[PDB]
Amino acid sequence: QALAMGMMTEYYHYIFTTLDLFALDVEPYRYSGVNMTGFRILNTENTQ
Amino acid sequence: THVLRFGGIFEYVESGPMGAEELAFRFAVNTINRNRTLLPNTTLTYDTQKINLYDSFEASKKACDQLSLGVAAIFGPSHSSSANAVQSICNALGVPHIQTRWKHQVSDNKDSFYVSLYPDFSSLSRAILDLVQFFKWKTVTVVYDDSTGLIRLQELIKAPSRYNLRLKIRQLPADTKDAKPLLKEMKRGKEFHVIFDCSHEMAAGILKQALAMGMMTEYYHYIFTTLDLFALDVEPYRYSGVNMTGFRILNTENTQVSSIIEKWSMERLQAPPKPDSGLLDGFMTTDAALMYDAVHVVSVAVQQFPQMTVSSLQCNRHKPWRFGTRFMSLIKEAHWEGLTGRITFNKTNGLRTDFDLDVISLKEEGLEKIGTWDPASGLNMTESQKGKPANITDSLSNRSLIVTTILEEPYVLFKKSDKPLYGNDRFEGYCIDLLRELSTILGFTYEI
Amino acid sequence: DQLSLGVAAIFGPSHSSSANAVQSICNALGVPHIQTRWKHQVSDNKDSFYVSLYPDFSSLSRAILDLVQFFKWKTVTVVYDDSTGLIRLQELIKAPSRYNLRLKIRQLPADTKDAKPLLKEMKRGKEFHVIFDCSHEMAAGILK
Ligand SMILES: *[C@@H]1O[C@H](CO)[C@@H](O[C@@H]2O[C@H](CO)[C@@H](O[C@@H]3O[C@H](CO[C@H]4O[C@H](CO)[C@@H](O)[C@H](O)[C@@H]4O)[C@@H](O)[C@H](O)[C@@H]3O)[C@H](O)[C@H]2NC(C)=O)[C@H](O)[C@H]1NC(C)=O
Ligand SMILES: *[C@H]1O[C@H](CO)[C@@H](O[C@@H]2O[C@H](CO)[C@@H](O[C@@H]3O[C@H](CO[C@H]4O[C@H](CO)[C@@H](O)[C@H](O)[C@@H]4O)[C@@H](O)[C@H](O)[C@@H]3O)[C@H](O)[C@H]2NC(C)=O)[C@H](O)[C@H]1NC(C)=O
Ligand SMILES: *[C@@H]1O[C@H](CO)[C@@H](O[C@@H]2O[C@H](CO)[C@@H](O)[C@H](O)[C@H]2NC(C)=O)[C@H](O)[C@H]1NC(C)=O
Ligand SMILES: *[C@@H]1O[C@H](CO)[C@@H](O[C@@H]2O[C@H](CO)[C@@H](O)[C@H](O)[C@H]2NC(C)=O)[C@H](O)[C@H]1NC(C)=O
Ligand SMILES: *[C@@H]1O[C@H](CO)[C@@H](O[C@@H]2O[C@H](CO)[C@@H](O)[C@H](O)[C@H]2NC(C)=O)[C@H](O)[C@H]1NC(C)=O
Numbered sequence A: 001q002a003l004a005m006g007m008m009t010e011y012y013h014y015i016f017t018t019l020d021l022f023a024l025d026v027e028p029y030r031y032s033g034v035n036m037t038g039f040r041i042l043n044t045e046n047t048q
Numbered sequence B: 001t002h003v004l005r006f007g008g009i010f011e012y013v014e015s016g017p018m019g020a021e022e023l024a025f026r027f028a029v030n031t032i033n034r035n036r037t038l039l040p041n042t043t044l045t046y047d048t049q050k051i052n053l054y055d056s057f058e059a060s061k062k063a064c065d066q067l068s069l070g071v072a073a074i075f076g077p078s079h080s081s082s083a084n085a086v087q088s089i090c091n092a093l094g095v096p097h098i099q100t101r102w103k104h105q106v107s108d109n110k111d112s113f114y115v116s117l118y119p120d121f122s123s124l125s126r127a128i129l130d131l132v133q134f135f136k137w138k139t140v141t142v143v144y145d146d147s148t149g150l151i152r153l154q155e156l157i158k159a160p161s162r163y164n165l166r167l168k169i170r171q172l173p174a175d176t177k178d179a180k181p182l183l184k185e186m187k188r189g190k191e192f193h194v195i196f197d198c199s200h201e202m203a204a205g206i207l208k209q210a211l212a213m214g215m216m217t218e219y220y221h222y223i224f225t226t227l228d229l230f231a232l233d234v235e236p237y238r239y240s241g242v243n244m245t246g247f248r249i250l251n252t253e254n255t256q257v258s259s260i261i262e263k264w265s266m267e268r269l270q271a272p273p274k275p276d277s278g279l280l281d282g283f284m285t286t287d288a289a290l291m292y293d294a295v296h297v298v299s300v301a302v303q304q305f306p307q308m309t310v311s312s313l314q315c316n317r318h319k320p321w322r323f324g325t326r327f328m329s330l331i332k333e334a335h336w337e338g339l340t341g342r343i344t345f346n347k348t349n350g351l352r353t354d355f356d357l358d359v360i361s362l363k364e365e366g367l368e369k370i371g372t373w374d375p376a377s378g379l380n381m382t383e384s385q386k387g388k389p390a391n392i393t394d395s396l397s398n399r400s401l402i403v404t405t406i407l408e409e410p411y412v413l414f415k416k417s418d419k420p421l422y423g424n425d426r427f428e429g430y431c432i433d434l435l436r437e438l439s440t441i442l443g444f445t446y447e448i
Numbered sequence C: 001d002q003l004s005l006g007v008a009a010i011f012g013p014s015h016s017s018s019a020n021a022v023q024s025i026c027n028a029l030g031v032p033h034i035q036t037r038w039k040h041q042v043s044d045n046k047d048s049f050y051v052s053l054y055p056d057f058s059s060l061s062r063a064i065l066d067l068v069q070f071f072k073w074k075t076v077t078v079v080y081d082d083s084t085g086l087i088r089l090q091e092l093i094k095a096p097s098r099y100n101l102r103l104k105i106r107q108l109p110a111d112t113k114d115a116k117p118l119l120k121e122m123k124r125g126k127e128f129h130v131i132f133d134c135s136h137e138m139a140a141g142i143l144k
């Protein structure tokens, strides 16, 4: 709904107070110009 | 009573059903046939053939095979390379050649016996040039797809000379639809007033890539040089803030036309549109709309010249067909209110110049008519724009403080000058030089 | 009539409308088709059996675009004669985007060689760096 109202541009920045931002499909949004920052406690670096 | 055969050169599809133009041609022969007042007494027989659409040699035989069987008018190959071959055939042997798509008309190709029902890009490029003046742009940007497309907009390329535009023509990349590096460079250049020149298939795929790079915002306006903007699925874009304006010749207001379009989508039985195409499902494109109007313009002429019969012409033994010259004049002088408004031709070469556009745009309801263009007229816009009010009320309190004074030396007296002055500069002396100090302190405007 | 008698290679009609017909003929029946003048090669016309010995305007339009950078122009002006001519210079029309040119494309009047109203308007606009696109016949008559 933020995309359909064209509200994800170069001068919008979204902080998501959640720990599952990494599980979003960001593929329509990756080129959009939109800055969007979150947090993640789940280690996606550890091979274990 | 009378048998009359028409030409049926179309594209050769091999897997799916036939193309939209051939379905329009099969429909238009069938529609007039049971409708026994318009062409009441003749038994019109379509003769469809199929070419690979990029072979003038294949289109040459399919033209000759129809005239060896004998036709009245070939209704057009749909490509610039193949149509120029068949146009030379129909000029030589005499039959009229009915065209529904644009091509580069060579200015030194002195031919007769051809009309083109597609609206000429000479006339259309005025309407874009009228439309960019309505929005008062100065930083337009043409994006085309084929090298043919510079011919289709040449009146717009030729206008930084007369007007104050600044053209920055770009091209879509070939062999792909991945226009990702283009719109990144256009976002970098702050290209805010883009004019596209695409087909409606590539007009849909360019917007999803414009959406995915967030380039459809409140300060982007897209003019589409196409006549099928109305057949786009604009539902993801309707709330986006994006202004996008086009043109439409197809009357969506006439109930007679809307009865045909409602009948059309039922009688298609076509492969369903993928939702990754971005197109709406049931609509006549402007390609098939003209092919429906292609027969009806000819169907006016066969009424006024009923004694015409079918003759088997030979390409190798070329002879001018004797009925064609009389029959061609009724085509060029024909008037018909088809799907695309009135169809009137050009007394010079058989192009279509006088027509009726309906300039549509995107608002939060969807696509919407916001005016009407005509060649004889200008833009008949300011359709929804209403009044342009204004209210500022300067001279702050509410007046510039009418000061009543009287001429007395040395208090107030007229100023001596070689040029006679007008207004407050007429007066000099003590009291107005006092009043200039009072106006400096209290900060007011005065009228002596 | 030449292939019924039998030839090896047709050496080209000299016009864009007539060459595209014979190019489709030589592609079908197999003989090579030798071309000496430019035409609009359609990008979706998948043909073989043809070569064009005329230097391509894709490559030439680089050399004009190289040459206007050598003289460091900013106020170029293309004057062409046929509507075909915008295809022949399309790499020059597409370069106010990359470089700092400012194109002001004009057209010679058709059905005549009387380009008197053109050059009056070009003198008025201080058009000092004109690029013509003409044949050498019209290149002579434009200079007088
Ligand atoms: C939200 O904010 C981020 C900034 O905090 C955005 O980053 C921008 O976009 C890309 C993504 O990384 C960056 O490109 C990288 O740049 C480095 C540095 O080389 C470049 O240096 C300058 C930039 O100052 C540039 O002019 C050069 O041409 C180089 O390309 C490269 O090494 C990387 O490979 C990568 O290309 C941008 O530099 C960065 N821009 C800014 C202004 O910070 C992020 O993308 C934003 N989200 C969006 C736009 O959706
Ligand atoms: C792109 O620019 C266009 C201008 O050239 C914009 O057209 C604007 O349309 C918006 C709304 O889409 C209007 O702005 C406000 O809307 C009302 C119109 O609502 C009318 O219709 C409702 C039906 O629900 C009905 O209640 C009334 O008949 C309303 O009159 C205007 O009347 C307001 O004054 C207000 O301006 C404008 O009509 C129009 N112009 C502008 C400057 O907004 C287009 O939407 C633009 N795209 C955007 C803003 O995203
Ligand atoms: C056969 O075609 C004729 C057209 O010449 C139809 O007559 C008129 O068609 C127009 C279409 O724009 C309508 O607006 C008129 O109302 C029609 N006249 C009438 C109904 O009297 C005619 O209707 C067609 N035949 C049938 C059976 O519908
Ligand atoms: C087809 O042919 C006859 C020719 O006489 C038609 O008769 C006339 O047709 C014209 C145009 O179709 C009409 O304007 C006239 O009103 C018709 N009648 C007369 C007396 O001239 C007739 O319509 C058709 N006949 C059959 C059997 O189908
Ligand atoms: C532009 O709009 C219409 C085109 O039909 C013209 O007038 C309309 O029709 C009547 C008679 O004038 C009136 O209801 C209104 O004036 C218009 N109705 C609308 C716009 O719904 C109008 O004169 C045209 N203006 C031109 C050509 O300058």
Ligand SMILES: *[C@@H]1O[C@H](CO)[C@@H](O)[C@H](O)[C@H]1NC(C)=O
Pocket (backbone or CB within 6 Å): B122, B346, B347, B348, B349, B353
């Ligand atoms: C078609 O008619 C118009 C006048 O309405 C005039 O330009 C000319 O006779 C024809 N157009 C062209 C481009 O030849």
